[PDB]
Structure formats: C-alpha cells, structure tokens
C-alpha cells in the first residue's frame, strides 16, 4: 500500500519546532509525484537528490519531520545554516540528503489575540547535533549564581513564544515545514517509489 504522507502534511495541528515531530515511514510504496502536487508550497528545496528522482529510489526508512516556524526563519532549515532555529531547535547536517517543504500557515496557526502555543528554544549552552530534539524546560543559567529552577535575573525560561497574529507581516507569520530524510543503510530497503 501507499506511504502515509497525508497524516503529516494534512495534520490539523503541528508541533513546536523545539519539540518537532518525526514520522518513520517504512514498508510501503511512496508516491512522491502526487505528494509534491498535493498543495502549493512557498519553499521547495532538495539537497543531494532530485525531487523527480525519488520515484526510482529505494530507502531503508524515510523520515518526515514537521514543525512550525516564522517566515524569516525558513531559510535556516537547510544544510550549513546557523541561527536560533538551526542552532537550538532543528539542525540539518552539512551533507543532508532530502527535501525541505514549507508553506504559509497564517490562516491555520495565527489567532486574534496571538497564538501562544508555538514556541522555540531561545537559550541553550551548546548547539544541537543534526536531528537532535531537546524538549527540556530547565531554567537557563546565564550567570554564576545557580537558578535552582527559579526564574529571575540571569535565570531565563529557555522557550519563547511566537505569538502569531494574522495581521503580522509575512516574515513574522507562521510557516509549516516538512523535511523528508532518506536513511540508506546496509539493510534491505522498505520504501521504494512508483
């Protein structure tokens, strides 16, 4: 049967970028042509593979990662990028093989008084490894004195809200992102294209 990309692309609610979702896709026939013509996308970029070539390729597993970021941050979802999102929320390797798909979701993820359900990590001691997920909410120690889980001076809550409002500019509007990774191991493949 077909691979269930619709459960990722057409989900009614998306995850925060710091707690990004990942769907492992296995033991199915992937139909990329219908997937890539399923909707209109504001960003469509592939690395190490052509979009039209996936119909001929077989992979051990395919990963579909999904999250919401703001418009001016979609450029960070790419190999070799730095910034708050790539350093502290969602990181792609330098030799990333896959595709990055994004579309404006202002009509879905903004609210009248500000949508405060989508957050990103603002403070972190060190950069994430590629494909790492950090869901810690520990108070960030910005100075010498320890925080003991209490907010205050030099003691910051690590997450920040986007506060999406539909009247914002496009750079500040929410964008849903789907990243397709293609894990090629020395094992029998389970996901081939048609």
């Amino acid at each position, epitope marked *: 049967n077909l691979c269930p990309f619709g459960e990722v692309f057409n989900a009614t609610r998306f995850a925060s970028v710091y707690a990004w979702n990942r769907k492992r896709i296995s033991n199915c026939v992937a139909d990329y*042509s219908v997937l*890539y*013509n399923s909707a209109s996308f504001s960003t*469509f*970029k*592939c*690395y*190490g*593979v*052509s*979009p*039209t*070539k996936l119909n001929d*390729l077989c992979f051990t597993n395919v990963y579909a990662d999904s999250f919401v970021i703001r418009g001016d941050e979609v450029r960070q979802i790419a*190999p*070799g990028q730095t910034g708050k999102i790539a350093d502290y929320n969602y990181k792609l390797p*330098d*030799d990333f*093989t896959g595709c990055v798909i994004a579309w404006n979701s202002n009509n879905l993820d903004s609210k009248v008084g500000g949508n405060y359900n989508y957050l990103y990590r603002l403070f972190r001691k060190s950069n994430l490894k590629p494909f790492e997920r950090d869901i810690s909410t520990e108070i960030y120690q910005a100075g010498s004195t320890p925080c003991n889980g209490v907010e205050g001076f030099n003691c910051y809550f690590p997450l920040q809200s986007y506060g999406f409002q539909p009247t914002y500019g496009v750079g500040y509007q929410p964008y849903r992102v789907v990243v397709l990774s293609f894990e090629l191991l020395h094992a029998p493949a389970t996901v081939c294209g048609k």
Partner: antibody
Amino acid sequence: EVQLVESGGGVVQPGRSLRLSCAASAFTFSSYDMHWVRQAPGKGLEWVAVISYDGSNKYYADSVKGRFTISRDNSKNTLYLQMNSLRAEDTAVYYCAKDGGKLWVYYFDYWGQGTLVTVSS
Amino acid sequence: DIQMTQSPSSLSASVGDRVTITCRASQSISSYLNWYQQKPGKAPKLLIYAASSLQSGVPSRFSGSGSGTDFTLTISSLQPEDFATYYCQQSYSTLALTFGGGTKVEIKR
C-alpha cells in the same frame, strides 16, 4: 548520438509572450527529466526550469517563477517553454538540456543548439 | 544560494601545457560538481560530472578531482581546439542549481 533541436526565438515586445520548443531524438525521452538553461549576451549560464519525465512535476528558478511555464508532449518527443510577461532581462540564448541519469542529482549531459530571444520594442 | 567561485578568470597556455582550473563552493556540496566547456557561439558540453567522472566521448586529457569546497579541472595536454570558456556547476542544491563565473582559456602561441 543524442540530438536536441530548438526553435521559436525572435523579437518580442516587453510584456508579450513567446513559446520555445525543443525536439528530442535517439533516446528514451519519456523517462528523463528535461531542463531549460539560458545565457544573457556576454554573461554566464542560468538554470531556468525542470520538468519530470511524465510532466507532472515542474520546478523553476526564482527569477522566472510564475512568469514562465515548462511543459512536454512525450508523444511528440518535444519539450516546451512558455514565456509570458517578458522583461528586458529575459534577453538571452535559451538552451534545452537532457538530464543525465547516472546520479541522484541533476546534471546536463546533452544540450540543444540554443535559440535567441530578444525582448525589445 | 550556493555561490561558485572560479579562479583564474582567464589564463593563457600554449599547446602541450598542463592547465588546472579551480572552483570553490560557498559551502560543502559533497561531490556534486560538474564541469562544462562552451566554445564561442556554441552550446555548453559536459566534460566531468560528480567531481571526477568522465562523460562518455570526452577525450582522456580531461580530468577532475576534489571534494567539499575545493574542486579542480585539469587538462593534461592542451590542444588548439581546447580554447573555450570552462564553467563549474554544483548540483547539491538540486532545485537551485548554480554555475561558476567561468574561466576563459586562451592559447599561447
């Protein structure tokens, strides 16, 4: 012995349209991706668009997106480039290119001879 | 957008000389670097694909090497008909293919 023969270039006023063609021969046309690459006079090469083997997926460079359209008629072994709202910057020699099928990524193994498009009034 | 930088922009070598052209990438492109030759008034021609693979029919005096950010095209023994402009082109970002500025090779005589 792979041939790509283009045609359809000429003079076009700014804002008007023009349609280029490129006929393929001596290879399995309906199973290869096809590209368009242009070159302004005295400048370098610029990738324009790509269409899948069956014509269902189309991708464009930001410089021509929503303004140009690529298509193919596999029963005629011909590739097309529909150019609307032509600006002065669109003046270039346009090439069609076959995608070599030995990699996971795009590359142009066979090119057409090119046809000149001059946007002028 | 990955910017490709070619050096030198122009060079002059005589027949039989060894010619090496350098192409640098603003970021790692693995091995997806292709080389093209374009004669004056002619369509480009594929010489090397995937950093070092020789395209069928290309003469043996052409070769390539490199990885990551530094790549090279080498003409072992320059011939008179080798006068052209040589472009490098990265294919790692498949939906934003970019070319280098090109290197014009001129024949010393």
